[PDB]
Design a protein around this nucleic acid. Structure first.
Ligand SMILES: [Zn+2]
Lengths: 102, 84, 131, 97, 157, 114, 60
RNA sequence: GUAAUGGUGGGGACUCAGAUAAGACUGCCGGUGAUAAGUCGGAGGAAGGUGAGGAUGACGUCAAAUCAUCAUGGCCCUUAUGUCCUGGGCUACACACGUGCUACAAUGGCCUGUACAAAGCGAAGCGAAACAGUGAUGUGAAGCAAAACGCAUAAAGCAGGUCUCAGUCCGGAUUGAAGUCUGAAACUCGACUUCAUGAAGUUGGAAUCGCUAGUAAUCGUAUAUCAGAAUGAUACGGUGAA
């Protein structure tokens, strides 16, 4: 299969900056000249909350909200120490977060 | 209906009060709050006044009271047998 | 990678999805690695499923394989019906008019509603009892 | 059916309770055989009384009456009289043939 | 008020035993609880039992005729003019004919006394075939009740 | 037309169900009685001979407590709680629910008819 | 809410069965939400204003 | 790989997941309509006349609800109406009304074998394989911050045996005995299991409620609050009409 892979999961609330960080990372690694497996989209996680509207009796009337989490995945072939160091060194706009496994 | 592996429940303060009464020949009344304490067979033949939230209701404990709880014999709300 | 399956299609229903594979043969049907008759136990639903073939007078000369999941028994029957229709279309343009005449190309976008707050169900409401 | 007298933030003198009953026997000669329920809610909210009478008819009609007053006896007199008159009006609605 | 309802489904002409819509409609009227398979099995077994109680090969024929022996012609619909309610006769439509028939057989069979499922319904079906029983009684009752009140037939609006 | 423990069973009834007519016997323990005296539960309570029913009565008053004694110490248990003046005892005394049910709207299967 | 009740909820009980969660913004003892640690009314107000990231209106 | 598992090596074909786009706008055709606006059918098309559902609720009304979520004018208490704890109580009854669940039974009850889902949840939390146990559950720890594993072999259904219109193998309330789990504690005042106990109830008067299609109807599943405890509430799918 492969000697080892770097599994990096991108978590965000916002699709735009999540995507932006995704191409930022893919460009950053192709600069380092490594073969890459495609940014693969994981299912979005939706948590729906239903709350009352009035601060008192009125029960038939309510309101619904979501929290939406968007997830992407990157796989890195043939891990390199310099490649991992650069990945950890990369700075990142707020709202998109990274999880790394060797 | 506790598990067997837990054994009966008796509060510790009530339990060493029971031991002190057991080592005393005087059969003094014990006033208590822990209605949830099980009647352990050792403490048969005592007199305990349990608090039902208003007053201390007394009981003489016989052998057959064993296995119950203290609150079982101190009524907490009174009905006058008529709803008027 | 023989690609013996000459054509392939997909079909959907309430919440079920089926993948259909046309092969050369005597018309045998294989569903989820099980016999078609043993899988779809209701002969009604089996006739339901085989209706596109009887209409396109092609049963008995093409073998079928089906990989179907989701939905209930009726949903899966409808899904495989739709898959057969789409596979026949992918095979031949000649069957297009008759299949569309029977409505086998337009699939039942009809799906279950969602429950709404203040309602016991999608449309049922709580009892009023005004008196 | 027999009438349901409810009260909020107030205490029923037996005088006023049987006053209400004495005003309500007007129904059980003419109207009782035509109604499902007759509720009378008394409230005492702004140093005044608020009365809500309510009647349901056997043919799907619903009568409601809301009033305010200062003295319970006077308020009950006016409200019950209005209720009885509106009930008579609806009965005649239907029986006009 | 906004009439001309959307076109009915009508696509269920049961492709299981007879390619006939009327059997499908009868099974649908039979349904309790949302159990189409149970209804289909009961109806198939019961009509088979009827066809061998009368010993004919063609079951469609006997089933259809036992229906048509109950399908009514003129029914009573109530209107009211000038504070006077009149039970005017009016000619039913064909769809309502099958509906009233099937409803009457189903009600009589369900409320009858019997041992079992297809037992009750086959028994009622042959009673209808022979033009006797609760269903036929109800049909003729509606017929000649409408006929006993034919004076108001000029109120067909 | 066998009689066990004073109760003679309806001959028309499937015997695994017929024994349930004996107080202290329910469906499950009727099943143990059948498979423990080695009589097919499907055999009717009419075609039963005498030696095997002697076997059943052996089983019954060997392993189980039946209407007489069962009534005896259920009444004994009730009176034991009732004379000792416990909550449950005085509850039995009054005629009100024991396990802590509502006693304002839905307690008249014990309270009786309204 | 009652500030003393807020502080007692914050403090350590004799055991966890003695302590109940409260909206520590307003101290409402109930209507609580664990994901946000605050009551339904505080949640509605602040999510409506957009002060709770990630929480928007739900069309179903 | 003998299993059970795409399980293993493999493979982008498909489903699928999620980003970016196309697509349905009376666009086109016929009839009618004041040359109109509109309107009834037809073609194409997954979708046709707002496709279906949700979100979105004008000026104002009812001195409508909330000082008890918060904020707040005035008034009021200041070893008190404040505050720490123990226990009781919010679970009290001759009664009346409203909301639901389970039934009254044959489109069914019970026994055995077998088949098909979706949406969700897991960090003091999920907790598997197995074994003990009729059972509630117990010992154990694999795997997992999880479209990776676990909750979780969904139930109606189907294939057989049995019941025979019987207050019944229908109904499971009520009580007795012995257990399970939670936590320091569950007697008043928890849930669940095993065994017995087997009541009312024969489709319910006047009157009244919900619903136009995946809708009623019914069958299960999941979540929120939560140490523990839902027939309520929120959400999901199965069968599926008139
Ligand atoms: Zn708050």
């Amino acid at each position: 299969i492969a000697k080892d892979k770097i599994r990096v999961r991108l978590f965000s609330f916002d699709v735009k900056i999540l995507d932006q960080s995704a191409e930022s990372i893919v460009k950053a690694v192709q600069k380092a000249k490594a073969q890459i497996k495609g940014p693969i989209p994981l299912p979005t996680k939706i948590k729906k909350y239903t709350v009352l509207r009035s601060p008192h009796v009125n029960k038939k009337s309510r309101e619904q909200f979501e929290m939406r989490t968007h997830k992407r995945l990157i796989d890195i072939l043939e891990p390199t120490s310099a490649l991992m160091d650069s990945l950890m060194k990369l700075e990142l706009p707020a709202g998109v977060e990274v999880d790394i496994k060797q | 209906a506790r598990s067997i592996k837990k054994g009966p429940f008796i509060e510790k303060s009530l339990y060493q009060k029971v031991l002190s009464s057991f080592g005393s020949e005087k059969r003094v009344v014990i006033k208590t709050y822990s209605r949830s304490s099980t009647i352990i067979p050792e403490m048969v033949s005592l007199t305990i006044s349990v608090y039902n939230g208003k007053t201390f209701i007394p009981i003489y404990i016989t052998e057959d009271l064993v296995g119950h709880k203290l609150g079982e014999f101190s009524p907490t709300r009174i009905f006058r047998g008529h709803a008027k | 990678f023989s690609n013996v399956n000459l054509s392939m299609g997909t079909g959907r229903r309430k919440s079920s999805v089926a993948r259909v594979y046309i092969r050369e043969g005597s018309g045998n049907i294989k569903v989820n690695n099980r016999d078609f008759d043993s899988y779809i136990q209701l002969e009604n639903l089996r006739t339901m499923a085989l209706s596109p073939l009887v209409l396109t007078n092609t049963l008995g000369k093409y073998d079928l394989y089906i990989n179907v999941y989701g939905g209930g028994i009726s949903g899966q029957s409808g899904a495989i019906r739709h898959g057969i229709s789409r596979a026949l279309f992918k095979l031949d343009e000649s069957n297009k008019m008759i299949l569309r005449s029977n409505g086998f190309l337009t699939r039942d976008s009809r799906k279950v509603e969602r429950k709404k707050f203040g309602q016991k169900k999608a449309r049922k409401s709580f009892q009023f009892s005004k008196r | 059916m027999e009438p349901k007298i409810q009260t909020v933030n107030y205490s029923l003198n037996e005088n006023e309770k049987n006053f209400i009953l004495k005003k309500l026997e007007k129904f059980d000669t003419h109207i009782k055989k035509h109604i499902d329920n007759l509720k009378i809610t008394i409230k005492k909210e702004h140093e005044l009384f608020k009365l809500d009478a309510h009647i349901h008819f056997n043919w799907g009609k619903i009568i409601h009456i809301r009033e305010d007053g200062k003295i319970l006896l006077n308020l009950i007199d006016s409200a019950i009289a209005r209720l009885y008159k509106t009930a008579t009006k609806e009965k005649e609605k239907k029986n006009n043939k | 008020m906004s009439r001309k309802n959307k076109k009915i489904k009508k696509k269920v002409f049961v492709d299981t035993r007879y390619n006939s819509r009327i059997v499908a409609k009868f099974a649908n009227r039979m349904m309790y609880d949302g159990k189409k398979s149970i209804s289909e099995s009961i109806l198939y077994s019961s009509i088979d039992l009827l066809a061998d109680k009368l010993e004919e090969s063609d079951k469609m024929a006997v089933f259809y005729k036992a229906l048509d022996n109950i399908k009514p012609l003129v029914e009573v619909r109530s209107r009211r003019v000038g504070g006077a309610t009149y039970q005017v006769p009016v000619e039913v439509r064909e769809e309502r004919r099958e509906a009233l028939a099937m409803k009457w057989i189903i009600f009589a069979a369900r409320k009858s006394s019997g041992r079992s499922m297809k037992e009750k319904l086959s028994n009622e079906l042959l009673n209808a075939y022979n033009s006797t029983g609760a269903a036929f009684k109800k049909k003729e009752d509606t017929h000649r009740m409408a006929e006993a009140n034919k004076a108001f037939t000029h109120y067909r609006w | 037309m066998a009689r066990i423990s004073g109760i003679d069973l309806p001959n028309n009834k499937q015997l695994k169900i017929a024994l349930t007519s004996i107080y202290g016997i329910g469906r499950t323990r009727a099943l143990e009685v059948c498979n423990k005296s080695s009589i097919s539960p499907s055999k009717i309570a009419k075609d039963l001979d005498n030696d095997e029913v002697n076997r059943l009565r052996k089983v019954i008053e060997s392993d189980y407590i039946v209407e007489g004694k069962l009534r005896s110490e259920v009444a004994m248990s009730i009176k034991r709680l009732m004379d000792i003046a416990c909550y449950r005892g005085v509850r039995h005394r009054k005629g009100l629910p024991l396990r802590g049910q509502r006693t304002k709207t839905n307690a008249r299967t014990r309270k009786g008819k309204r | 809410a009652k500030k003393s009740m807020i502080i007692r909820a914050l403090r350590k009980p004799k055991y966890k069965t003695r302590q109940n969660n409260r909206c520590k913004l307003c101290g409402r003892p109930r209507g609580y939400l664990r994901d946000f640690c605050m009551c339904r009314i505080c949640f509605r107000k602040y999510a409506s204003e957009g002060l709770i990231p990630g929480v928007s209106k739900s069309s179903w």
